[PDB]
C-alpha cells in the first residue's frame, strides 16, 4: 500500500541545521507524529475563527492570528516573521 509522510522534508531541514547529524527512524516517526498534530491544531482553530466571523475562506490573516493564538511568545513572534517573509516572497514570486 502507498503511505505518504513527511520524512524526506524533515531530513532536508536537518541537513540544513546539522548537515552531518544522523537520525533514527522512530524519532523521525515522532517528527511525523508531531507535525501532523500542530498541522491539525492550527487548521481547526483556523477554521473556527472563520466561523466566528462567519467567513467561508481561510487565508493567512486567519492563519497568522491563530499562530499568534497557538504559538506562545517568542515562537509566535518569530514564526509570524517566518510566515510573513515567505508570503511576500511568494506573492512577489
Amino acid at each position: 500500500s502507498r503511505k505518504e509522510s513527511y520524512a524526506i522534508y524533515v531530513y532536508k531541514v536537518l541537513k540544513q541545521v546539522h548537515p552531518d547529524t544522523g537520525i533514527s527512524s522512530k524519532a523521525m516517526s515522532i517528527m511525523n507524529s508531531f507535525v501532523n498534530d500542530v498541522f491539525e491544531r492550527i487548521a481547526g482553530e483556523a477554521s473556527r475563527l472563520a466561523h466566528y466571523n462567519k467567513r467561508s475562506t481561510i487565508t493567512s490573516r486567519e492563519i497568522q492570528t491563530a499562530v499568534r493564538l497557538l504559538l506562545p511568545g517568542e515562537l509566535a513572534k518569530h514564526a509570524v516573521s517566518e510566515g510573513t517573509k515567505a508570503v511576500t516572497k511568494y506573492t512577489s514570486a
Partner: protein, 80 residues
C-alpha cells in the same frame, strides 16, 4: 496604577470564605494579587487577539467566551 490593590482584603477574605477558608495568613493577600494578574493577563492578551482580528475596537464578551473556552474554562450565560 495599583488597581490590583483595589481588590481589598475583605474582597480577598470574602472569596476565601466562599472558598471555605477558616484562618488566613497575612502574606496570602499579595500572593493572590500577583497570581490573579497572571489569570487576567493571559486571557486579555488572547481575548483582544480576537477583537483585533475581527477588526473591531470594542471588546465583546463573545470574544471573551471564545478565549476562556480556548483556555479550557467553558462558560455559560453571556450570549452563546
Amino acid at each position: 496604577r495599583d488597581n490590583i490593590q483595589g481588590i481589598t482584603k475583605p474582597a480577598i477574605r470574602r472569596l476565601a470564605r466562599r472558598g471555605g477558608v477558616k484562618r488566613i495568613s497575612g502574606l496570602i493577600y499579595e500572593e493572590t494579587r500577583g497570581v490573579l494578574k497572571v489569570f487576567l493577563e493571559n486571557v486579555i492578551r488572547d481575548a483582544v487577539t480576537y477583537t483585533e482580528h475581527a477588526k473591531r475596537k470594542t471588546v465583546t464578551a463573545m470574544d471573551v467566551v471564545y478565549a476562556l473556552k480556548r483556555q479550557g474554562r467553558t462558560l455559560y450565560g453571556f450570549g452563546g
